[PDB]
Structures are given as structure tokens and as C-alpha cells.
From Swiss-Prot:
Belongs to the LpxC family. Zn(2+) binds at residues 78, 235, 239. One of its GO terms (cellular component) is membrane. The gene is lpxC. The lineage of its organism: Bacteria, Pseudomonadati, Pseudomonadota, Gammaproteobacteria, Pseudomonadales. Its EC number is 3.5.1.108. The active site is at residue 262. Keywords: Hydrolase, Lipid A biosynthesis, Lipid biosynthesis, Lipid metabolism, Metal-binding, Zinc. It comes from Pseudomonas aeruginosa (strain LESB58). One of its GO terms (molecular function) is UDP-3-O-acyl-N-acetylglucosamine deacetylase activity. The keyword Heme does not apply. Catalyzes the hydrolysis of UDP-3-O-myristoyl-N-acetylglucosamine to form UDP-3-O-myristoylglucosamine and acetate, the committed step in lipid A biosynthesis. Pathway: Glycolipid biosynthesis; lipid IV(A) biosynthesis; lipid IV(A) from (3R)-3-hydroxytetradecanoyl-[acyl-carrier-protein] and UDP-N-acetyl-alpha-D-glucosamine: step 2/6. This is UDP-3-O-acyl-N-acetylglucosamine deacetylase.
């Protein structure tokens, strides 16, 4: 069978919040079968645990934020992307502060640290959410849709006019083991234009060339430029895999986003969950006939 996966060992990282600029200590821990990904604010007494699920999402403003009462876990999309990409069902994510560390802006450091520690297949069937009908949402021109597909595939189009794009489209099939190579190292990005305002609403406070692609009027500012020519839209795919993992299981279907962000991504999951004829939960008692395959543990 395609088995549930956790971490083989505990992982410790130290970084900064992209939006808060706060020093945070990250501890990823093994978790039992059917735990899912649970975030934990360990700086609070008592410890406050928020499962990484669609229902727990609060604001979706320049990131995906989980909320329980007045308590928040901000910027979960890149770490969840990494977990989703490597096929991690069950893990406790402890944070010493409200926001996940930004690292280099990518999921690369997360996939590196996780695979350094390694994965543990568990004695239980991995559950997948199979898309059964098309499910679309639209906020005027912006647009997000799930369509049935035999495997996992994510398509996305940046529509907006800026000199730096030399149109950014991409469409990637993650039915096999493509995630690390294709999208993992795609960094987040922001415009010099927006920084003054974002800092005024307590955002991008930890933002710099170290953890992001910074885009002036005409040029990328980063000394060493891009990792891929389509890095911008590859990151929109990275974000999408993160947000989509808030379903709490791996997807068997296709996602297409036209200028869709965290807001629409979450609207999509909320509608999908509501429409129980548009999806079902499946396991695979034989991995050889499954539409998805994963890296050796
Ligand atoms: C939400 C989104 C973008 C997130 N970011 C990344 C990001 C970097 C940035 C900056 C700066 C800077 C500066 C200087 C000041 O020190 C050095 C000049 C601001 N910003 C921002 O809002 C994302 O990746 N979410 O996961 S996205 C791709 O749009 O969906
Ligand atoms: Zn992002």
C-alpha cells in the first residue's frame, strides 16, 4: 500500500518572520498516524495547537494565516508546500513566535532539512482527496479551479504587466517525484514599489534580498539574479501546493490558477469541502496501480 509518512528524526531551524521580522525557532517532530500537520505556539503557556486545515485559516493577506482565538500562525504556505511535496502526512510544527521562518524565500531549506533527517513510512494507508467534478471560483478576473486528473498536476498564469517577465505561465505534473527539481527552490517575490505601504501595515518587515526576489521598476535587485527564468510563476505553484495541503491530505486532480492568491486558494478549498459530490477519500492497497508515486523514504 501507499503508506502514511512522518519524519524519521526531529528537525530544528532558526530564522525570521517575513512579515513580523521576529526571530523564531522551528521544531518539526514525528507525529502518529492520521495526526495531519499541527502547528504549535510553544512560546505561550499553555502551548496553543492549530491543525493545518482550511477551517482554521484566518486572514489571507500577503500570506496564509491560521487562527484560533486571538492566536495566529502566519506564513504556513512554503513549509506546507515542502511537507505536501515530500508526502508528509503527520508532523508537529512547534514555533517560538507567530510566524514561520522565511528562510531563503523558497521551500529548499525545508526539503533539505527534512530529507537530511529523512522520512518514516507508517503502518496505515495514505489517504488522498480525489477530485470527481470541476470546482471553480472567480473574484472578477482572478480565477482558481480543481478538475479531475489521474495524478497530481498544478497549472498557473501570472497575467500582470511588468518589464521583468521578459507572460509567466507553467504547468507541472507531480504524479511522479518532480517537486524538489521543478519548484522547491522557487523564492517568494515583492516589488520596491509596495515596500513603504506594506511596512505601514506591519508587513514585509523581515523582507530583504536574502529571503526574497526584490523587483525594482526595471531590474531584479538580487546580486545573483534568478534560479529559473520562470521562477516567479514556479513560486505561485509552490504557494498553491502549500495552500491546497490545508485539505489535510494529498490531492488526486489538477489545480489551475489565473492570478489566484491565498484568498482564492482558500475560497476554492471551502467550496470543494462544501460540495461533497465533487470529491471523495481514496487509499491504495497496491502502490503499483496508484496514479501517484513518492521518493524512497
Ligand atoms: C504572498 C506572496 C508574496 C509574499 N511577499 C514576499 C515578499 C518580499 C518582499 C519584500 C521586500 C523588501 C525589501 C527591502 C527593504 O529592506 C530590501 C529593499 C515583500 N514580500 C511579500 O509580500 C507569497 O509568496 N506568499 O507565500 S505571493 C508570491 O505574492 O503570493
Ligand atoms: Zn509564497
Amino acid at each position: 500500500m501507499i503508506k502514511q509518512r512522518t519524519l524519521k528524526n526531529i528537525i530544528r531551524a532558526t530564522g525570521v518572520g517575513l512579515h513580523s521580522g521576529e526571530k523564531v525557532y522551528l521544531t518539526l517532530k514525528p507525529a502518529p498516524v492520521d495526526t495531519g500537520i499541527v502547528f504549535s505556539r510553544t512560546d505561550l503557556d499553555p502551548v496553543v495547537e492549530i491543525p493545518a486545515r482550511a477551517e482554521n485559516v484566518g486572514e489571507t493577506t500577503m500570506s496564509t494565516t491560521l487562527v484560533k482565538g486571538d492566536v495566529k500562525v502566519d506564513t504556513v504556505e512554503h513549509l506546507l508546500s515542502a511537507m505536501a511535496g515530500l508526502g508528509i502526512d503527520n508532523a508537529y510544527v512547534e514555533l517560538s513566535a507567530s510566524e514561520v521562518p522565511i528562510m531563503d524565500g523558497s521551500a529548499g531549506p525545508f526539503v533539505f532539512l527534512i530529507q537530511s533527517a529523512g522520512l518514516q513510512e507508517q503502518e496505515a494507508a495514505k489517504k488522498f482527496i480525489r477530485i470527481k467534478r470541476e470546482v471553480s471560483v472567480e473574484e472578477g478576473d482572478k480565477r482558481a479551479v480543481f478538475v479531475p486528473f489521474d495524478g497530481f498536476k498544478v497549472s498557473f498564469e501570472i497575467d500582470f504587466d511588468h518589464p521583468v517577465f521578459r507572460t509567466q505561465q507553467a504547468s507541472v505534473d507531480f504524479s511522479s517525484t518532480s517537486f524538489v527539481k521543478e519548484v522547491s527552490r522557487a523564492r517568494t517575490f515583492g516589488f520596491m514599489r509596495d515596500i513603504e505601504y506594506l511596512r505601514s501595515q506591519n508587513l514585509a518587515l523581515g523582507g530583504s534580498v536574502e529571503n526574497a526576489i526584490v523587483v525594482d521598476e526595471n531590474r531584479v535587485l538580487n546580486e545573483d539574479g534568478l534560479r529559473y527564468e520562470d521562477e516567479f510563476v514556479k513560486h505561485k505553484i509552490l504557494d498553491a501546493i502549500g495552500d491546497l495541503y490545508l485539505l489535510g491530505n494529498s490531492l488526486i486532480g489538477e489545480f489551475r490558477g489565473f492570478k489566484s492568491g491565498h484568498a482564492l486558494n482558500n475560497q476554492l478549498l471551502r467550496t470543494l469541502i462544501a460540495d461533497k459530490d465533487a470529491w471523495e477519500v481514496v487509499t491504495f492497497e497496491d502502490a503499483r496501480t496508484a496514479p501517484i508515486s513518492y521518493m524512497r523514504p
